[PDB]
């Protein structure tokens, strides 16, 4: 295994969009079709002419010797649709056809090695698959807003106005729009040089070198693990301790039964002399008509929408009076550390944490307390104190550099304090030509 090697599968539609219009610019004969017969000989010889090393799958079963030629040479296969891969090649002896499963990665189009193309990198895709799917009218609105924030107004855009019809509007969502020549019938032609200049060869619509070089560097700040401060999910438990620092995930106790929250396991039935909301243990099928011994479980709420009242309380009561470990997910929050002195400024409730709208991100502050002078030897004692009800599971501290710059005793670090890293303290040298370098190490 290795979560690597094996074979490389890609959907046909992803192939035609990125790979097909790019290997088409150069004068290489289109990728050879995979043989129903076995051609473990010329698989790479015909792939040598094309250079991309991707092979189009069609019909039949891939040979045993062609099953290993694909694994070693790092060549890629494109199937129309994968319900399975079992029958596509018939994994003969070892177990592979559909057992030791796949994964998910990205390619960055590094299989070309031809410059002036593929300017953008991996990171742009990651940013894309994060926002909600935008409709036609939403995209049109989004284009307009960014345009008018920089003054340059769009009185009319994409919209055509005929005087005997009114004002019709088109969409504005193109993709890899490669300005190409139309034949009389209304069909895209292709690239026949000596007829169509050099300006229309590629490219991503941008200001030559200047924008592409600027975007390339600026894209990296956007996908950095120090800027993304929108932590997801919160685990809710009722152990009472408190700790020096924030971001203290209290691990689930030794022996627990992890039950998946359902809109069914909570039923209403009569116990003793009144109506009560009752739990139903999934592995043993029981009652327990009161928030006492359950026994303790590890809950996991996904849909905190249709949960409704009464049930939202039996969950928030069994955590207190039975030591239940509950969980939430749809809750989104922005966390910021708070100094021990001055204390809290805002406090939320455990009832509102069960009714908060799905997409409304509130901030809930976490207390520090690493640097706080302990009480004097002579003072009044205490009686049964603090219980904390919420915990982040991230952790919620990405921006640090250094922490609590005060000395303990006189010559040693206080327990749990950090110093600045040997990276923000190293001015490198310029590259052999262009940008910035590091040390070099050793």
């Amino acid at each position: 295994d290795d979560l690597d090697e094996g074979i490389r599968m890609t959907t046909y539609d992803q192939y035609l969009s990125h790979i097909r219009e790019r290997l088409h610019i150069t004068n290489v004969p289109d990728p050879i079709y995979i043989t129903g017969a076995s051609t473990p000989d010329q698989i790479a010889a015909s792939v040598q002419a094309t250079h991309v090393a991707v092979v189009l799958y069609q019909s039949g079963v891939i040979n045993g010797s062609a099953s290993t030629y694909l694994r070693e040479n790092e060549v890629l296969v494109v199937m129309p649709d994968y319900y399975d891969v079992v029958s596509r090649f018939a994994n003969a002896n070892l177990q592979m056809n559909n057992n030791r499963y796949h994964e998910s990665v990205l390619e960055i189009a590094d299989i070309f090695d031809q410059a002036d193309f593929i300017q953008t990198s991996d990171a742009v895709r990651q940013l894309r698959a994060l926002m909600p799917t935008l409709s036609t009218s939403q995209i049109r609105h989004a284009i307009e807003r960014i345009a008018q924030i920089t003054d340059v107004d769009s009185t009319d855009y994409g919209k055509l106005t005929l005087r005997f019809l009114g004002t019709l509007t088109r969409s504005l969502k193109m993709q890899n729009a490669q300005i190409r020549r139309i034949r009389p019938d209304g069909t895209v032609l292709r690239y026949d040089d000596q007829i169509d200049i050099e300006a229309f060869r590629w490219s991503r619509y941008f200001l030559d070198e200047l924008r592409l070089r600027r975007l390339s560097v600026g894209l990296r700040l956007i996908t950095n693990p120090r800027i993304a401060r929108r932590f997801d999910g919160v685990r809710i438990m009722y152990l009472t301790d408190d700790d020096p620092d924030p971001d203290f995930v209290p691990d689930v106790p030794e022996g627990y039964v992890a039950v998946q929250y359902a809109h069914r396991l909570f039923s209403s039935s009569l116990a003793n002399k009144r109506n009560r909301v009752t739990y139903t243990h999934p592995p043993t099928g029981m009652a327990y008509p009161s928030p006492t011994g359950r026994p303790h479980v590890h809950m996991t709420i996904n849909e905190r929408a249709g949960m409704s009242k009464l049930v939202a309380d039996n969950i928030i009561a069994s955590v207190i009076k039975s030591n239940w470990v509950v969980d939430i997910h749809d809750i989104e929050y922005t966390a910021e550390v708070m100094t021990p002195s001055e204390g809290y400024t805002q406090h939320v409730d455990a009832e509102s944490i069960m009714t908060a709208p799905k997409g409304k991100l509130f901030h809930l502050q976490f207390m520090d307390g690493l640097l706080r002078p302990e009480p004097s030897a002579f003072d009044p004692p205490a009686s049964g104190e603090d219980m904390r009800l919420i915990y982040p599971l991230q952790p919620i501290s990405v921006a640090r550099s250094m922490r609590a710059i005060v000395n303990h005793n006189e010559v040693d670090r206080p327990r749990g304090a950090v110093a600045p890293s040997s990276y923000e303290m190293d001015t490198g040298t310029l590259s052999r030509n262009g940008d910035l370098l590091y040390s070099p190490v050793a």
Partner: protein, 50 residues
């Protein structure tokens, strides 16, 4: 690591359940670390030894 002179900060402590019939509900509760005392108005030690 030393005894502070200037007064600190508190949650601060609150009294709750005492009588022989409660019928509590556990609504609200804040989730911020706080303190809850059983007996009302304790802290009795007025003797000062110079």
């Amino acid at each position: 690591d030393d005894v502070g002179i200037m007064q600190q900060k508190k949650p601060p402590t609150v009294v709750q359940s005492r009588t022989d019939v409660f019928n509590e509900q556990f609504a609200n509760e804040a989730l911020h670390p706080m303190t809850k005392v059983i007996f009302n108005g304790l802290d009795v030690n007025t003797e000062v030894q110079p």
